[PDB]
Design a protein around this ligand. Sequence first.
Ligand SMILES: [Mg+2]
Ligand SMILES: [Mg+2]
Ligand SMILES: [Mg+2]
Ligand SMILES: [Mg+2]
Ligand SMILES: [Mg+2]
Ligand SMILES: [Mg+2]
Ligand SMILES: [Mg+2]
Ligand SMILES: [Mg+2]
Lengths: 134, 205, 260
Amino acid sequence: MKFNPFVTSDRSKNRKRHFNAPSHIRRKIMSSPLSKELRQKYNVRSMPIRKDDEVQVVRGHYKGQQIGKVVQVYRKKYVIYIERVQREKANGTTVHVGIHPSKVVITRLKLDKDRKKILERKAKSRQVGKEKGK
Amino acid sequence: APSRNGMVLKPHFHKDWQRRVATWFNQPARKIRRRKARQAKARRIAPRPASGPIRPIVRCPTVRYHTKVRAGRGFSLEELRVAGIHKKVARTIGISVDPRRRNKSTESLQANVQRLKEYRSKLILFPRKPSAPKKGDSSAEELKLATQLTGPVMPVRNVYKKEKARVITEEEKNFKAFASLRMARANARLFGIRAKRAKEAAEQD
Amino acid sequence: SELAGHQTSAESWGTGRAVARIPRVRGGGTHRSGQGAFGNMCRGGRMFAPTKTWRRWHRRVNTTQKRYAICSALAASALPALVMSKGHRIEEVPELPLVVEDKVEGYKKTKEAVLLLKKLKAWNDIKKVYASQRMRAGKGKMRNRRRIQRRGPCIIYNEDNGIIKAFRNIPGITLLNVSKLNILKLAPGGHVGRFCIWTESAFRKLDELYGTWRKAASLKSNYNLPMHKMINTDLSRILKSPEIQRALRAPRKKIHRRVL
RNA sequence: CGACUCUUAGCGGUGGAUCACUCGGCUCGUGCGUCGAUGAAGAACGCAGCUAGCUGCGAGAAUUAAUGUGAAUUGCAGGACACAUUGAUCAUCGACACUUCGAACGCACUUGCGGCCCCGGGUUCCUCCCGGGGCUACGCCUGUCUGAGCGUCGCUU
RNA sequence: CGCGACCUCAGAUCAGACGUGGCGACCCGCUGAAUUUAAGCAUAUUAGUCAGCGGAGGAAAAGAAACUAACCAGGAUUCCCUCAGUAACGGCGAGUGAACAGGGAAGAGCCCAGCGCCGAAUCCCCGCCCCGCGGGGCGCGGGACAUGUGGCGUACGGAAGACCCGCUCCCCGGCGCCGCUCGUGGGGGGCCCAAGUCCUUCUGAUCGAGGCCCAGCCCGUGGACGGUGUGAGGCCGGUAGCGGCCCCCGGCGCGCGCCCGGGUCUUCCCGGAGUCGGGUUGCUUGGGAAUGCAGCCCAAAGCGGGUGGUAAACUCCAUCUAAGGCUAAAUACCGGCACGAGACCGAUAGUCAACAAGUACCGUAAGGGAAAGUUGAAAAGAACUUUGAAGAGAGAGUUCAAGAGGGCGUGAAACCGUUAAGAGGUAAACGGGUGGGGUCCGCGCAGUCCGCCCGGAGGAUUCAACCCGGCGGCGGGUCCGGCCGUGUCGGCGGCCCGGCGGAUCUUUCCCGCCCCCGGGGUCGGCGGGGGACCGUCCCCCGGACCGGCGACCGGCCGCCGC
RNA sequence: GGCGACGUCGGCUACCCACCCGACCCGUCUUGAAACACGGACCAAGGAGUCUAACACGUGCGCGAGUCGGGGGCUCGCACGAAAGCCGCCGUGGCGCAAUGAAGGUGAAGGCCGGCGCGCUCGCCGGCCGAGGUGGGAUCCCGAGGCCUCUCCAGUCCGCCGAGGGGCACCACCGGCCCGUCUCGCCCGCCGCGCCGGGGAGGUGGAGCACGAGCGCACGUGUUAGGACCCGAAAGAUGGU
RNA sequence: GACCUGGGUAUAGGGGCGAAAGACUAAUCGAACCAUCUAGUAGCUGGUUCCCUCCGAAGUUUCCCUCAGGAUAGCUGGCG
RNA sequence: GUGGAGCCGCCGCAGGUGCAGAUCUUGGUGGUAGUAGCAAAUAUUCAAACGAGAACUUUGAAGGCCGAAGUGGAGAAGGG
Ligand SMILES: [Mg+2]
Ligand SMILES: [Mg+2]
Ligand SMILES: [Mg+2]
Ligand SMILES: [Mg+2]
Ligand SMILES: [Mg+2]
Ligand SMILES: [Mg+2]
Ligand SMILES: [Mg+2]
Ligand SMILES: [Mg+2]
């Protein structure tokens, strides 16, 4: 149950901040779960998705057994595009259908200077919580 | 416009009363607001007693209320004289002072001198550095609490006498009548007239 | 309604001109130029007798009826006919004023809370609340209450030592102090007989908080438990008693229908 | 018989009721309670590669800097991927900037006409010669400078 | 003639500052109606409100008695409950209408002119330096203010000065730093539990089922929201005196600076004027032989003056000290900035405005002022072929669905087109009664009884009858063991290592005192405590009953399943 | 007891039609409307007795000579909690428990017995009880008598019972009591002897007493003040263009 | 010709201007137009939304600036 | 049958609580009705061209009007 008197609970005021979010809040909200090989190894539950991570889709019309890199991240439409999943138009020009990143499993990340530091900080914040369990 | 047997009423609503309406919707929220202002003040004066200074014993004025005893505003500046504490030092030790107060009874005087010496009795001051003028040892085995509540010495204590049981004696069961009141009331309203009739009788010569 | 809904110029046309005598907006140009303005008939007008915020919202009940209703609600939580006829499946449960020891008040982890209700055989009411995880019918969903739920057992204690932390995640369950009881929590819906789990130190304060009939209560200044209009209350015993049927005449069990 | 009309029904129109939805109101409560001559509020006009409105801005104009954040923006193109440079984007916002009108301030309001001082080029200029800059409203306070009086005197003539 | 000092005045683009205007919900000062009510209408009411004008501030105004009272007296202001719809006002009609007691919220008090004392001991501006940040203070030096009166002590609750008496050396601001903080100071950013398990439904699942004896996992985390439909575990978040990061505060302790207080006695000093008050006038008030305010004329006193609610004269008594000033909190807040919520409204509703809304549009202007939400999970927004000049079609295609085709969810009525059936000179429609036709349903159609018991005809299985073993139940019994309920008592037991209560008692108990002759006297008592007694609720045997919806064992009776 | 197949049996509604009979168009004011009275072309959506304060009576609930925290306070900082619970030397206060008079002010208990002052139309002391009496009065109590297979012996039961008794509430009447006034009269008391105080007997005025019934809360109805069931003027005023 | 006319300018609402018609003052004039007081008042017209069951009127008395309205008694219903 | 995400029964609670009317409010649609109408200022004709398509466009030819106080040539205010 929510106990803080400074955070909302209404449908109208959570739907307003979700569709009118700034684009740096909006990458925190387009997060994605990791695989079982990768959260046994980095011990972190989920990450915000970025440009070159490779993904298998877990729900929808396209499901499973196709690892593929993502290629474009519409934050305006809350939608990622993946290099393999596409759709033929009437014209004959195939274009990417877009899917939502909570319907998505990262199977290999993209590591730079900053993605290392974020995984390191999201991990250390868990074994502090394991030390409350005395 | 009226009807059969009812009241004849004068409702005072012939004025623009809907712009001046007061709704007590904040009255829960002002009760928890003025609780927090008591709590945040009680720890700001942290060792000092809550509800501030000691107040005097005061008898209420009227025929309706002069049987009862009430907390007052402050001590009359002659109690502080007789109890022996300075008037500009009284309010800094925790004694409410009212300089416009008269005591025209000795009985009401000495009850607040005794009230004030009993306060100074069970008071413990704190030094700045432990030099202690007119002050003794460590703070009364650390003063048994920190802060008192709703009065230093419980200001009402409106007490009544024992007067156990007497034997109905002679001339107590005989005289003091209703006629004692009716002769007293006519002696009040004819006192000024008769003393005029004494002056007329003495100028006969 | 926010203010006047009369923030609009409108006077009647009054005279002939073959339209009804409702006030019309002034001017021209716009669509809102001769339309009928304020009155409880009109699109855009003012509602009949607009609600005022100084309607009397809050009601008084005097204290010896609030205490009457909360002595009447505990006594019905101790009858198995009444507490099962409200919905709580108390079929597998032991002795019906369920009290437990005072160790439960110092639980802090809700795994110690779930198996207590399984070992008291009171978990099956909680599993009935999980089946009543419906969503709201009607327009109450956009007024932010979308999920309806059943009330389950209530646990009444004293000296909170963590009992409020172990139970507040379990759905449909309620905690209340044995000092400060609530008729809104003991009789949900106005109906009597909610299933309650007690504690030793809670169950022993009721004799000093409401008193018996012989001594008045000590934690309430001038309260003694209310008197009883009936002593014997099962009239299948009273009317079958020898004193009554010695005095009764005879039953007249014929019919005597209409003779043609 | 065939049309015309009438009443039912099937289907199609015309129309936008109904129900379902809700980034809006409305009410109550809480914390705070802050504009301006250092140019407010308000108004005008201008600003995008393709831009009319709205929204955001001010010739640094759909924003600069700084700090946080850490790869997008996106209707279409274009160009920087570099992030062990300074790093896209977004938020924040303390540094800089902020056209004209407006209490609106040189006088006018007709983008009208000035007046002093300084700086660049022409008469190497004082005397109504192009450009840039600064100053130039009214009331009023303390002080300073100038000085009015057959106002009150003093020494002198 | 001139020179100089001042006094009254002028000028400056003089040096440095200040005021203007906006908002105006709440607050202050003015000013001010009429609708309306009186069943008419003049006073009255509306209403000292609306509109007009001027000033603020986060609050404002008010505020430390020229008070209330009338008795055992209270003691600044504001606010709340009461006083109270009361005293009072009113064509005494309609109507209007306070205050003091009392209980609370909050609580805080002070300053000057005068009166005298002190060698003007005071302040402003500029010049350079001791020392400084983010600049203002003590110092050094002139130019001013000022004796027509700056500063010190001083205030009506008294004050000062001098004797004598008994004590004491303190406080404030800046400066680093160290330690906290009561929901746990505030601001900002970035993080922290657990199914995407198996089968299955679907366009797509967030559905349906399932998880050994640890209850499939998490839970201080089952608020909410996006997610291809209904999600504690997919993802924000939520929970947590949860962590870590940067920034900003309230107060320890080194150097400034500032430093005699009290008591008694004596001597001396002591207060606001065109104001009070009065007369008259107009408004205001519940204020009535005038509550307040104002104009005008008259105009004070100093044992004085105001007030004491019926004008007036005498008298006694009470009470305060006016015509100068400041002041926190409790209180108000329909405007602003940020929020949280709801038994509220759901696109003709809710703000005029859910949308490019105070916009489009209208009026010379003041001003008036709308209408207008929804394809889909995703544009996947219909390539291509063919008819036509195109709009528009016929195919094809996408989609769960175009029977969702760019104001496209659902798609009502009025109204129209067409099809099918029926009918038609008393406009139509209607009520009662049948008949005929059509659509549809039901049975299934010259084929509908369903269960019970009995005697039959062959077929197949196994209790029962009765007894033995058995656990469980019902009922009744000496109420045996346990049990209580009502009075009646005692052990006064636990009352002093027992609770509650008492306008019971005890001047022989106890704590400071009051009354008369350092003491004595109960010499009469005050407030506080102690234990005695009554009325109730706790333990043991005694007694009366009842075994009550309080029960277990024992033996009996008859059920019962194995 | 009988009769009937693959198109026949049974069935009814907002189906259509036909015939007989009956039948004027509603709402509305009105003595009277089918009216040559008014409103109504059609359809959808909207659309009119509300709240608040006061009072009255009815009803339900709690307590009851009382009653009620509404205003404050307390509780740990909790979503729900703008709730709930608590106070009690927080009951101040409101309403009720006492009326009456303009006010000064005064302020609701009688009956039976015995004795004596001229038992003198007037009275005084003491005991005993203690809200009077009369007439009706639900209910209750007593009840002679009576009621069953053979006659004399006895106890619960039961029903009928003429009559008698105690009489609730309420109604009518008589008597009394308190406060105001009026007539008539005498006596008594002394914080001090008076242009003092108190008492009596009769008649009257009062929203009174005569063994209390109120309070708080809820609901319903009625009336009133507020925009007041909804819509409607000709106006008046204020400030502006 | 007391002529016709443009632009400039002045006068404003119980006011203006009028060779006078109560003419004209922005299609408005025997008192403009805008906004507010304001949802002003009406004994007067119009309307007043579901079903069934039971009971069921009055248009008369007396007073009123009363006569299209009230108050009062009668008539009614509801509760006992 | 259409539709594509919510909904109802019971016991209590609470109302912005049910329409045929108000010359009601707003929106939509009829009948009248393919009707009234497209009649003030004399007037059109032939051929051609471009075009899917010509009573109206253009071009030539004829016939007419305005007739110099103009249906001609330029301006002011106004428009933008
Ligand atoms: Mg909201
Ligand atoms: Mg619904
Ligand atoms: Mg259709
Ligand atoms: Mg301000
Ligand atoms: Mg920048
Ligand atoms: Mg220049
Ligand atoms: Mg619409
Ligand atoms: Mg009719």
